[PDB]
């Protein structure tokens, strides 16, 4: 009873204005460390089941270490960037002399500390697993040399349990060339993660946002394998910083709009190409063309500013009056008269053309409405299912009021044959000029004759 | 006991994470793949709807239950950790003396608990929606 939606029959589109923004504007880089134990060399002869298992597990431990040692419409306008450029930058610094030692020094006493590195950047550091103390002090002295007898079997379980976390981490990086996303629990546990969130210099609200949506933060995060110099494993976890919160958001749904004259082809189509998510953020509007990049948790819409264009606030005028002189609304044209449907947040837009059967159904009563060739909309409340031809769409069941804005479909104002129909990222004014050009050429070419 | 305690913390941490979660072609148009799945989910958030299904599944692990939306849905209880924990684990962990006899109890609990952990793991890395549906899931 928050989120609402409006359908514009005039432009075959719909806008949902009940959403709140969640923009990633930046990156925070933290350094996670694991103090590791070097081994040389377990030398136990005689194969005892209890001896073989510890050795085998220790062999598993060593191989992990070895593997790590071994590792060392629209949208086309967005441009390119390097997602892990920030994280890689941190990794690079870590490859310096006794920088390891600097950080290895601060984390000896506590498991958490900020160390200023020679780049000058202060970074939160975490020692989450100390296999070293356990392996070097409990395990290693018994194994050397010749006689090794291991009793109390619960010990081999404890070591496999402790070692296990390291093994999944070595496993993941192995299948991701040292960059994983999303960041798994093995890489960084929730307690560790929540602890990480509290020292990040963001708003108490921003911390609040991330903590209720940790599962989202993980998908927008990167874990980057760096170095294993000295006796410490170190990798950098790259977390999103949300500089934009609680600003109004809206999602634009579009569908092909065509004339419904009786002939077979000879039809003209039209489709709005500025579909996607729009959000208010700095007096302008951040527009996200590919709405795959935006995750939704009801009230909150999570987006990454890298795949976006920053547009003027006049962009909203295209939804109410597409012919405004203040903004040239982006569109496409076609002769492709094909039926399809678009499921919106609180309903469904149905582009029905030709002899195609377009229908809406309820789970209980069955078919409840047969569409009359054109762009229409139906609420989510009285409808559960939509079938367009042989393809069946399911409708969203959220709560919220929808508004049908009546208006003559815009495509009907144009005379065929003078209409430009092969336009992919054109616009209103860009269409009008070609018609004008064609209006001039048709009109001037008979005046002379 | 510490091992069981550690695993029970694992059991709890798993529990906690879930609680916390709460050419051509361009002509094809868009739809909502999980619109059907999401619709069911929504219905389940009502009063004692849970209780309705919890009642039918006490005796059998399989029954068709009609929800208040009216939709009849096949229901499956594939893992009853409650019974294992309440009947096998809890009476052993609370023996006044924190003895424990033999180790097969911790192996047995790690084995049973393990499946839930992979499921909580997948949902954790998928914001509560996974595809394909893994063996751990089903």
């Amino acid at each position, epitope marked *: 009873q928050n989120i609402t939606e409006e359908f514009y029959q005039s432009t075959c589109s719909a806008v949902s204005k009940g959403y709140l923004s969640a923009l990633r504007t930046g990156w925070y880089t933290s350094v996670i460390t694991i103090e590791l134990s070097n081994i040389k060399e377990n030398k136990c002869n005689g194969t005892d089941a209890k001896v073989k298992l510890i050795k085998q597990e220790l062999d598993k431990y060593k191989n992990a270490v070895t593997e790590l040692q071994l590792l060392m419409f629209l949208g086309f306008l967005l441009g390119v960037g390097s997602a892990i450029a920030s994280g890689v930058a941190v990794c690079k610094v870590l490859h310096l002399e006794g920088e390891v030692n600097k950080i290895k020094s601060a984390l000896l006493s506590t498991n958490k500390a900020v160390v200023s590195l020679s780049n000058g950047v202060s970074v939160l550091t975490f020692k989450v697993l100390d296999l070293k103390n356990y392996i070097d002090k409990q395990l290693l002295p018994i194994l050397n040399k010749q006689s090794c007898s291991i009793s109390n079997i619960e010990t081999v379980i404890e070591f496999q349990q402790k070692n296990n976390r390291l093994l999944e981490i070595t496993r993941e990086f192995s299948v991701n060339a040292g960059v994983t996303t999303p960041v798994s629990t093995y890489m960084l546990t929730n307690s560790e993660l929540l602890s990480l969130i509290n020292d990040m210099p963001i708003t108490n609200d921003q911390k609040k946002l991330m903590s209720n949506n940790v599962q989202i933060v993980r998908q927008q995060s990167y874990s980057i394998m760096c170095i294993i110099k000295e006796e410490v494993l170190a990798y950098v976890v790259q977390l999103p910083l949300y500089g934009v919160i609680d600003t109004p958001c809206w999602k634009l749904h579009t569908s092909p709009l065509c004339t419904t004259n009786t002939k077979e082809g000879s039809n003209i189509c039209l489709t709005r190409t500025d579909r996607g998510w729009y959000c208010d953020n700095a007096g302008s509007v951040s527009f996200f063309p590919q709405a795959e990049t935006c995750k939704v948790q009801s009230n909150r819409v999570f987006c990454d500013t890298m795949n976006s264009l920053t547009l003027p606030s006049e962009v909203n005028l295209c939804n109410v009056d597409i012919f405004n002189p203040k903004y040239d609304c982006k569109i496409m044209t076609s002769k492709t008269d094909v039926s399809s449907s678009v499921i919106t947040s609180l309903g469904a837009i149905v582009s029905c053309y030709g002899k195609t059967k377009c229908t809406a159904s309820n789970k209980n009563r069955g078919i409840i409405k047969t569409f009359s060739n054109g762009c229409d909309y139906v609420s989510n409340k*009285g409808v559960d299912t939509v079938s367009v031809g042989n393809t069946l769409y399911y409708v969203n069941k959220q709560e919220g009021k929808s508004l049908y804005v009546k208006g003559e479909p815009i495509i009907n104002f144009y005379d065929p044959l003078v209409f430009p129909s092969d336009e992919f990222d054109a616009s209103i004014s860009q269409v009008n000029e070609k018609i004008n050009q064609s209006l001039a050429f048709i009109r001037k070419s008979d005046e002379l004759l | 006991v510490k091992l069981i305690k550690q695993e029970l913390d694992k059991y709890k941490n798993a529990v906690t994470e879930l609680q916390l979660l709460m050419f051509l072609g361009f002509l094809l148009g868009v739809g909502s793949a999980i619109a059907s799945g999401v619709a069911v989910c929504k219905v389940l958030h009502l009063e004692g709807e849970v209780n309705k299904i919890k009642s039918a599944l006490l005796s059998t692990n399989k029954a068709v239950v009609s929800l208040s939306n009216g939709v009849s849905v096949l229901t499956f209880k594939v893992l009853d950790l409650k019974n294992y924990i309440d009947k096998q684990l809890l009476p052993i962990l609370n023996k006044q003396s924190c003895s424990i006899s033999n180790i097969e109890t911790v192996i047995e609990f790690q084995q049973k608990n393990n499946r839930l952990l992979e499921i909580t793991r997948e949902f954790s890395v998928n914001a509560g929606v996974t595809t394909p549906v893994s063996t751990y899931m089903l």
Partner: antibody
Amino acid sequence: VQLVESGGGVVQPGRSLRLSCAASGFSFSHYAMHWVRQAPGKGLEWVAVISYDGENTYYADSVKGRFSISRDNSKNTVSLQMNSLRPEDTALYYCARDRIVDDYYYYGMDVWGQGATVTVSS
Amino acid sequence: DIQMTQSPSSLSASVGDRVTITCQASQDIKKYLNWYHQKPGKVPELLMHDASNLETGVPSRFSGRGSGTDFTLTISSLQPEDIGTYYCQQYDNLPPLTFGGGTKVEIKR
């Protein structure tokens, strides 16, 4: 899972009477709600319905223009306003829950209140 | 407005008897039909919807048949607690939902 009616009693013909229905134990704001009446010793008569969100209403032909149904989702309450009552309106009035959630179609009733007696007479 | 007719108004059968009552609609209502049981002095109880789909907890001895305009409710083993009045009702499309006049079922000893 409980519905309790109130507001019944005697009313002189031509006059007015308001019924109220208090709901508990279910997700009230998600169900369509009906009123049904039954005169002593006679059959059931559907009277009116209101959608779960109160946007849509329908009435029996015999009470159209005279009765009005409303609801308050914040108070888990349904009311039935009865104007210009006739002696033929004397009956037991039931408050009843639609069996289906969040729908603008109306179906049967699976939960019934005990009812309030309203007598219209000189 | 859709008219619902029930028959008989009253009937007599013995305990254990198979009892059938009929409902007829003034127009095609597919299977949009409900059945109710009202014991004397008690509130009505919904027995089934979509003409034949029994509510949970409703005894297996009740079964419904029919489609279009002609419907039947069958009790395969009439029990003592089955007395009262049975009502049909349509919910085909638009309201008013309408009830039948009711069928009183009596048991013969």
